[PDB]
Ligand binder design. Structure first.
Ligand SMILES: OC[C@H]1O[C@@H](OC[C@H]2O[C@@H](O)[C@H](O)[C@@H](O)[C@@H]2O)[C@H](O)[C@@H](O)[C@H]1O
Ligand SMILES: OC[C@H]1O[C@@H](OC[C@H]2O[C@@H](O)[C@H](O)[C@@H](O)[C@@H]2O)[C@H](O)[C@@H](O)[C@H]1O
Ligand SMILES: [Mg+2]
Ligand SMILES: [Mg+2]
Ligand SMILES: [Mg+2]
Ligand code: NA
Ligand code: NA
Ligand code: NA
Ligand code: NA
Lengths: 409, 204
């Protein structure tokens, strides 16, 4: 517990940019794109106000659009007089991917017609399209093969406080070890992480901070409408914060909370508000109506585990169940607790042979051990129960491919 | 029940079945079969023939049957086993786990074939496990896969009985003969004996 991420003060004008959304759409061969940016203001509307959105490639401006506020008519009462959407044509854009994280810079200016700037906001933009077609998850029209890992925000001395040096260390080791994707298990991360994934190039699954694993049954809260409001904010406020990061390619509704009607409502909310990214969620059998991707945890390659209600089928078999057509990417697989990873090659062979097996996220990146000191003051790695905590789950907190200090296992 | 249409020796295999001038002759092989056998309950599936590539004549005939008798699925393996002229993915000799990615007409592992992008049909091999001589090695691997995967709905072993013919030696005693034993040439020798049983019905 505590105040474990940054605290800051931000001084905005009273007439201000209060939100902005960047979308990129493409023609059939990605040789042309339209960047569309919706900008919203708070404050007093005045006829002399304008917004300009400019797109930069390095120090060169490649496109720009300027307009006064006042959106298109949307219903019988008119439109949003406090919004405007700029559309910029971009020829032959440099596309973003984990392989080549090409980025442009969008600067959003709130200014007057005669040239005075009131304030500006801005973001890195990656031109990429994410879509599922014909059963395959495609990035810029090509099917991905996710070499992913789940990563908790953990440091053996600082707990859950994250710092730039550690995040950079983790990304460098991930890329150096042939990973191209990361799942934010199981909550939105410190803001800097997305900027690093945008720039260094990693596909990100951003996941809402909702996990109710200990309920009996697991969906007791998530199927209860009285918990819909609290859940809703955990999903909506994550999309509101992170929707402009190109590295985020998939939204997740949380983790291990069964499957409840609140999930279906929230899945639909995201699909309406942000059609640019698939939504996944594994609860309740990994292939429910609240997921665009079959995303099981620890389903085996060839071996079925036919648990009642929530069976974990062999991933090869799952794909072909009657009526099924979605891609399958494991949200967690290969549990790297202690001396483990036996059988790892079996997954890879299957992922390469089956088009619709598009990979998975290993569980997990780094052991959650904590440092304690002996009487000598010499440090040692501690796990559950070592702080007098009870009940506890002993060494189940250490499932990483790397030790807490980042030394590889 | 399968129409008497096989043009395996053509190059390419669909040279006649994609030629409209052969549509009339092919049509009668299919229509006259359905007219004769459509009241038998034992027939559950019609087949358009065997090993004649995939030609437009097949698509015309597939549709004719679908119109006249909607009570039974239509299958046909030519041209890749999964063309628009078949309601069932019906490969011959596709392996359980091993792909054989021949150009144009790959033979995928059956488990993999079911889940190719956009595929949703059942898969029942029209021919599998070639029982020529001392064979059937690997039979169990098919059965384990059929029972584990709902959409792998089995198959037809190749084949029931050896096509050996009896000849008599100088002493009048009978012996089993195969290709080339009658002076026939060219011939394909013992490839005519692929059955689970000998020609006299004794089991292998
Ligand atoms: O690293 C721990 C791992 O636990 C997973 O759950 C393990 C196991 O917990 C038992 O209490 C249940 O009987 C059983 O159904 C469950 O599989 C969890 O799925 C992972 O996310 C991870 O925490
Ligand atoms: O019992 C023989 C068996 O042969 C199969 O064809 C074998 C092989 O022979 C080559 O001449 C062909 O060009 C090649 O494509 C073919 O696979 C035939 O598929 C079976 O029906 C059966 O006659
Ligand atoms: Mg300017
Ligand atoms: Mg305990
Ligand atoms: Mg010969
Ligand atoms: Na694959
Ligand atoms: Na754990
Ligand atoms: Na089956
Ligand atoms: Na033969």
């Amino acid at each position: 517990s505590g105040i474990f991420r940054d605290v800051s003060l931000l001084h905005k004008p009273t007439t201000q940019i209060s939100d902005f959304h960047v979308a990129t759409r493409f023609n059939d061969d990605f040789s042309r794109a339209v960047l569309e940016a919706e900008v919203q203001m708070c404050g007093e509307l005045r006829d002399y106000l304008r917004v300009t959105v400019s797109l930069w490639q390095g120090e060169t401006q490649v496109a720009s659009g300027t307009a006064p506020f006042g959106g298109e008519i949307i219903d019988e009462r008119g439109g949003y007089a406090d919004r405007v959407t700029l559309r910029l044509n971009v020829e032959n854009p440099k596309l973003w991917s984990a392989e080549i994280p090409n980025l442009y810079r969008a600067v959003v200016e709130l200014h007057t017609a005669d040239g005075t700037l009131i304030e500006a906001e801005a973001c890195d933009v990656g031109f990429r399209e994410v879509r599922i077609e014909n059963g395959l998850l495609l990035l810029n029209g090509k099917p991905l093969l996710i070499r992913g890992v789940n990563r908790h925000e953990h440091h053996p001395l600082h707990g859950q406080v994250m710092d730039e040096q550690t995040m950079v260390q983790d990304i460098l080791l991930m890329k150096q070890n042939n990973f191209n994707a990361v799942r934010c298990s199981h909550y939105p991360n410190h803001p800097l992480w997305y900027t690093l994934c945008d720039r260094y190039g990693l596909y990100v699954v951003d996941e809402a901070n909702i996990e109710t694993h200990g309920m009996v049954p697991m969906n007791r809260l998530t199927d209860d409408p009285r918990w819909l409001p609290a859940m809703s904010e955990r999903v909506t406020r994550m999309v509101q914060r992170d929707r402009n990061h190109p590295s985020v390619i998939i939204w997740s509704l949380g983790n291990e909370s069964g499957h409840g009607a609140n999930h279906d409502a929230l899945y639909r909310w995201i699909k309406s508000v942000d059609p640019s990214r698939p939504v996944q969620y594994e609860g309740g059998g990994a292939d429910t109506t609240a997921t665009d991707i079959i995303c099981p945890m620890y389903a085996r390659v060839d071996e079925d585990q036919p648990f009642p209600a929530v069976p974990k089928w062999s991933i090869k078999k799952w794909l072909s169940l009657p009526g099924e057509t979605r891609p399958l990417i494991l949200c967690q697989y290969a549990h790297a607790m202690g001396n483990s990873l036996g059988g790892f090659a079996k997954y890879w062979q299957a992922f390469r042979q089956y088009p619709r097996l598009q990979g998975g996220f290993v569980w997990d990146w780094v052991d959650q051990s904590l440092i304690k000191y002996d009487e000598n003051g010499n440090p040692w790695s501690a796990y559950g129960g070592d702080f007098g905590d009870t009940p506890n789950d002993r060494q189940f907190c250490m499932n990483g491919l790397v030790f807490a200090d980042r030394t590889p296992h």
